[PDB]
Amino acid sequence: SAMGQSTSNHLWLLSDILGQGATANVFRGRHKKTGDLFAIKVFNNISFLRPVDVQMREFEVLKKLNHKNIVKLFAIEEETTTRHKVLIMEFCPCGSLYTVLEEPSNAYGLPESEFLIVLRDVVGGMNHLRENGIVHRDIKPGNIMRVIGEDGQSVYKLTDFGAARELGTEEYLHPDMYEGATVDLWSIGVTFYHAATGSLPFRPFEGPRRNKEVMYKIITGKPSGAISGVQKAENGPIDWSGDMPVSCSLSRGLQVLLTPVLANILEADQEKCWGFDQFFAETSDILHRMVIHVFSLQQMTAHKIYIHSYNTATIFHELVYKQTKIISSNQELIYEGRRLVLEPGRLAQHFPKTTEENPIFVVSREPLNTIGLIYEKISLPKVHPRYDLDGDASMAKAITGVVCYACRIASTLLLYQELMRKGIRWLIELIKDDYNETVHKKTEVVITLDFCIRNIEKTVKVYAAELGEISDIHTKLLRLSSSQGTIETSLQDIDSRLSPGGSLADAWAHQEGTHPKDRNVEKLQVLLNCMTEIYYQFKKDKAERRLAYNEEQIHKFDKQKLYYHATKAMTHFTDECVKKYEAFLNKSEEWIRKMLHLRKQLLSLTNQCFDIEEEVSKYQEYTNELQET
Amino acid sequence: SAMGQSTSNHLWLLSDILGQGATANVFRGRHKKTGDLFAIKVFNNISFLRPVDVQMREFEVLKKLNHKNIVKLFAIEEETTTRHKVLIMEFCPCGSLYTVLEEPSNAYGLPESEFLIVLRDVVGGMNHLRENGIVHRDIKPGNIMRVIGEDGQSVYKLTDFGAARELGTEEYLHPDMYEGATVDLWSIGVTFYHAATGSLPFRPFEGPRRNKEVMYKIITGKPSGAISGVQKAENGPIDWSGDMPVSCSLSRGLQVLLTPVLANILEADQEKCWGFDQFFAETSDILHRMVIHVFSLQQMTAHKIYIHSYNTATIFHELVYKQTKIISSNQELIYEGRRLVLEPGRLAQHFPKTTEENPIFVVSREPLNTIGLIYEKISLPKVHPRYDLDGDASMAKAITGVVCYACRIASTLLLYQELMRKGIRWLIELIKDDYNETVHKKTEVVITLDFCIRNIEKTVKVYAAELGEISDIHTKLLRLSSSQGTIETSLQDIDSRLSPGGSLADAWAHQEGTHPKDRNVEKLQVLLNCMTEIYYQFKKDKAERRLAYNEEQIHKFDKQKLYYHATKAMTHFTDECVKKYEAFLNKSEEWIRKMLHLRKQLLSLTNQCFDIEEEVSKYQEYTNELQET
Ligand SMILES: C[C@H](c1ccnc(Nc2nc3cc(-c4cnn(CC5CC5)c4)ccc3[nH]2)c1)N1CCN(C(=O)CC(F)(F)F)CC1
């Protein structure tokens, strides 16, 4: 609060330090005459190599470089006393992407919505910089900034471009840049992996330590089309995977599109790997797609259908098939309480409106095993009695990061449970429709038919071999009523199963699982906030490096409470949320097997009324259709 | 950070001061051996009147007084050096009710959900204190504390009871306690009014100033059953109202129950006013009721039906009538895409599940004017160039408090708009059901009838006055088909109106109003946060009382920006949100008048098929039913 420098138009305190980096420091400053905030880049240690003409010249390139995803540099001024050239750039009050991924909530990846904002803005800004000539080659979470836009959605903005000429990140380097129009895209892929996963792609046991010799051959291994390599044992083996982890909170839909992107931008051989034209073309296709939410009611899973607005419904059903393994012919739909039917020519933009809360359910005639929600079972890390400032800040992010996953799963399981409740509720009312639709198609036959047998008796009453022909029509016309008598009665068996108290009651949906009234996701978040506030204090205590005795005891009580919250919340997640979800899931399995049976019985009954409907119209035309002069 | 006292087991810093009050100060403290937080009440200025036996004795009453809504007093200790008896009480980390109502969001009352938490806990705690003998007589927002419970919902907890024996709030006093089992309930009513409204019940122009002489006759006026009295002009007149204001963000449903409570606990005459037995009985009835959400689609209004879980559906329809003015016979229902039908005996607990997002729509045969949403049109207060610390903190709460209302209305209008969209979408599909239901009831007649005229021609073909009787049955049997030909064709007029592109298209719902994609409520909240952060800084600057030159200029730039945000958000509210809501509302008026017409035409057509359905079964029984030996 006492010391800090100033220039002709701007000023800044020295405690107000945002950034750090060998060429320069970045400070939160304010324009004098207006009081408006800017980021202020001061160049310490600059005195050996400052060329007036060149350095000033290239800044005028960036001066007028306007774009949504580029951190604007407003003016280049000189400092009053030290005669240091200072840069006046946009103050992005939210920090950087790294700042984001440090929040425990993002320990296992960003939210799907937020991840696409990153992809859109990172790819969009960079494409703009290449168009104007500039290159970056160093896209890192920490040099991608963030502002909350006017609509409340984030807007990411890149900086730190074009400084490699004058004079990047060790965790984001290429198989030949360890010890070039494509080399930029490796660091990109590493970033896009990190944002989706929550952790980096390639990692040894000790990490990027003095024992970072492992990392080079991990990076240069380039196996198959793999995207990650992780050795979980000291001096151990490097497990490869060309797929995202289970902890990844990203839709299956998107993963199937993102995996090829990252796989083909994370390679060594130059002629094999993609180029910014290929890459910018492929990422566009992702971001130009709309998302249709399809809940596969039969298998208790939720999906995101990443379809193009111009794509035909014939493609949509193929897409769904790739995720639900249901055939386009068998795929049935329900929407807002009513069977939905989809002509193949229809475009995706003219589908109904969907959300996770209210999606398009998918039913089938054929049976399907019910997988349920498929999540990663992560146990709590270790809370040690050691007093360590840096390893308690490290632990606090982890342990809380797990509870965020446990509180994430807890809510999705409830969405599933309540979506199943909803989808099942309509289905029974929609199967009840078919039993009541058949009754009217039955009277269409039984009344006409049992009036026709009276008419054949009315024919012999008014006006021999031909009398023997009449009784033959009469008996076989009463033989229709014999199978008609059975069909009417075995239909009333479905009446019982469907009607309240019967065999297909949804009574269980309401009294087996967990509910929004249970407030179990709200319950957890309470403890989550306790844990997260401790994490940020432990983050701050990391910065202080030394601590008073009174504070020391505090951070020793609070760390002990950070475990009690964690285990308190964890017992509640498994012994209440999970268990009662499993109980609801298992009970759901039986209703689906039981309901599918009804849906093949009720059909036969109907596909039979259609047949004795044919045989009455055909034979109310036998003697009624004879001739004479 | 330098000075603060301690006792045998607890300790506290002196800067860590939570409360203030002539007998004692309250500080945030911590138990030494555990590090656990408590509220610590230290008694300064106590030396004239401390009686050892009595004072210590009565604390042992409160020592073991356990209840959910009572701030527990754990131990009574003595301070090490000054020998001052110190109280160790529960630390309620959320502050008090007053703290809550100071947030600009609550400038025009608490949220409905939150208000009931207050009612429940205030009435529940107090009833418990009366049962054990203790009285309060001083229930004020500031001496009602708040904690976030384990389920995340608030839990309010009262303190400051039983100190009037040893030795309350001027804004919460009774017509005889200005210059007693019921007198407590006035301060209650004042509180419950304040929580619902956002402002106090009775107020002069200058307020509780040196010119507080007005306030006594306002309070003692006790007109009719009024609940508020406000003079808006200096030396002016006191406007009375026995009803809540429009700015009140509480359901009409609840207001109709709360107004009698407050009206009968805000009086002077003792024999006229309620008692805690009457009062605790009446408030229970409110809190034991469940809320059914009914959206009166026809009049574009949303309602909360405060019904008892044991009440019959015959009562429910009467309740709705009190709010929608729709008759129980005419009231029609729709739920999750399907007509809902309600037997009178059914209990409220066995109704379907409702939310504001997904409620029970109400349609009618009779017409109704469409009121729309009915809100208070509040203009921004005045931003003066005066530099005033206390009047800029005052202004900042106000101006931001209006924008919270404007951002509140903005969201409700969207709920309405999207609920109308949804309710209309089902209704057209549910009227389409009736046109397609009639066709099958039409074939039931036209096929049988146009097969019967062939049979009367088939009768004269096989086997005079009786021939002249046949042709008379024949012509009048073809006279049924004459009105049948018109009915089939004028039905296809409804086919066009209903079918896409027709006269009853919902095409407009999708392209006239505002949408969740417009992100207009998100847009506002962005500016709202800018304004609110300034408000809290201006609240903090109020406490400092003097300011540095650099800070002075800051608070002069930031105040100027607090207006620009406010007017920026306001233009967007009216010129975008309101206007496009009005446009959607006006267009809705026409579709309802147009759709109601169809619903009386399609019925007649059907109430006519029922009639030529009667006349065919009756006359396929004339000559078909003759006799002879
Ligand atoms: C958490 C958020 C934050 C954190 C980190 N960065 C930013 N915001 C930001 N960081 C920027 C960096 C650049 C930038 C441009 N080039 N480079 C290169 C060099 C890094 C190597 C960096 C440009 C704009 C930038 N905006 C904001 N803060 C901002 C307000 N808070 C302060 O002010 C702290 C004080 F009081 F202590 F100051 C505390 C809360």
Ligand SMILES: C[C@H](c1ccnc(Nc2nc3cc(-c4cnn(CC5CC5)c4)ccc3[nH]2)c1)N1CCN(C(=O)CC(F)(F)F)CC1
């Ligand atoms: C905003 C919230 C707050 C504000 C006001 N009160 C409480 N909490 C609280 N207030 C209480 C009062 C009583 C109480 C009991 N009797 N009486 C009678 C006397 C009032 C006349 C009062 C009991 C428990 C109480 N809990 C919490 N704070 C708490 C943590 N923060 C500090 O600590 C500030 C520091 F660092 F500066 F300290 C800053 C954030």
